[PDB]
């Protein structure tokens, strides 16, 4: 029953090939609802969920204005960060920013976040009090001093505790059929010999939402963490997710092994067995 709204922004420099590529996406939980791509023809923030389509012209105009302003800031940032780190024009570099807010089952604010990364590593992040900064290295200390002097945290806190939470509530209401649903996983295990003496056991979960799920293997009740191959949870493309976990076991020992599935859609966690 808990929920989140998050916006993700990626800007990538391209040496001697024009302006940086900029992409923004926004999500409620594991459902995308808006996008912007600097390389696309429209130059507009665009809907990517049926329930956001009803927002009027002022919404789309305002969101487009904001996202273009983010794009321009990250364009400057790529230059600034090359200065901070004494880097040349020879290579491409990446800035990422993500921010948003979490609410619990009662839709009341839990926490807010705002994090920035340069070349795949933490650069600077707002702390949990929304009043102070964690800077990951010396160059990010420079940003921290500048952002402290400019009172950026107070502005972000007002957004995260106010606007973010208010609009997440509106979206949860307008997209209730999609967003406030829970699809329990449809589960099964498969068995395939990999030789005359071993078998792969694979535990499947299909057709679930939200994406959060735990799949684990036990052998006589003991967790087989180091021997389990667990794949990344993946989109089926219809709004649901899939995940599997596998172990390779000696043939004849299948009955010692159980797969265990936890999801918020299940009335109880499931244990699947070979007997």
């Amino acid at each position: 029953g808990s929920h989140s709204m998050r916006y993700f922004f990626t800007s990538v420099s391209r040496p001697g090939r024009g302006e940086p590529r900029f992409i923004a996406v926004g999500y409620v939980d594991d459902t995308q609802f808006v996008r912007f791509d600097s390389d696309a023809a429209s130059q507009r923030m665009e809907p990517r969920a049926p329930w956001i389509e009803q927002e009027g012209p002022e919404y789309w105009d305002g969101e487009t204005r904001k996202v273009k302003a983010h794009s321009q800031t990250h364009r400057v940032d790529l230059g600034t960060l090359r200065g901070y780190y004494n880097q040349s024009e020879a290579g491409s570099h990446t800035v990422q920013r993500m921010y948003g807010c979490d609410v619990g089952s009662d839709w009341r604010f839990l926490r807010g976040y705002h994090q920035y990364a340069y070349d795949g590593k933490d650069y600077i992040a707002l702390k949990e009090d929304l009043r102070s900064w964690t800077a990951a290295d010396m160059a990010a200390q420079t940003t921290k001093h500048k952002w402290e002097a400019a009172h950026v945290a107070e502005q972000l806190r007002a957004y995260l505790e106010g606007t973010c939470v208010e609009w997440l509530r509106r979206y949860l209401e307008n997209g209730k059929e999609t967003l406030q649903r829970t699809d329990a996983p449809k589960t099964h295990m498969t068995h395939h010999a990999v030789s005359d003496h071993e078998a792969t056991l694979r535990c499947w979960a299909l057709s679930f939402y939200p994406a959060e799920i735990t799949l684990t293997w036990q052998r006589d009740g003991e967790d087989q963490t180091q021997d389990t191959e667990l794949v990344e949870t993946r989109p089926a493309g219809d709004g649901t997710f899939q995940k599997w976990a596998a172990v390779v076991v000696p043939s004849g020992q299948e009955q010692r092994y159980t797969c265990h599935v936890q999801h918020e859609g299940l009335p109880k966690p499931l244990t699947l067995r070979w007997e």
Binding site: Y7, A24, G26, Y59, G62, E63, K66, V67, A69, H70, T73, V76, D77, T80, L81, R97, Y99, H114, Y116, Y123, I124, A140, T143, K146, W147, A150, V152, A153, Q155, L156, A158, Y159, T163, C164, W167
Partner: peptide, 10 residues
Amino acid sequence: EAAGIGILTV
């Protein structure tokens, strides 16, 4: 809605 304030250059 995205942030309309607090997004400043590093």
